[PDB]
Amino acid sequence: TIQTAQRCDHSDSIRILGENIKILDRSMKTMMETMKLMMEKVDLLYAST
């Protein structure tokens, strides 16, 4: 009863995966930034044609 409800939940792993989701958010933000820079580069390529 108590041990079954202990088995069916893993709260510490929820906290670890939430921290890992935050890490994924940071990586998404830095990829958006480098897409913005190479957007600027391709735009100034296409302007000078």
> Which residues in this chain contact another protein in the complex, by CB under 8 A?
26, 29-30, 33, 36, 40-41, 43-44, 46-49
CB of 41 to another protein, least distance (A): 8
Hey, which residues between 8 and 27 contact a second copy (CB under 8 A)?
Answer: 8-11, 13-18, 20-25, 27
Measured CA to CA, the distance from residue 5 to residue 9 in angstroms comes to 6
CB of 2 to a second copy, least distance (A): 6
Residue 49 gets which letter from DSSP? -
Closest CA to 35 of 22, 49, 27: 27
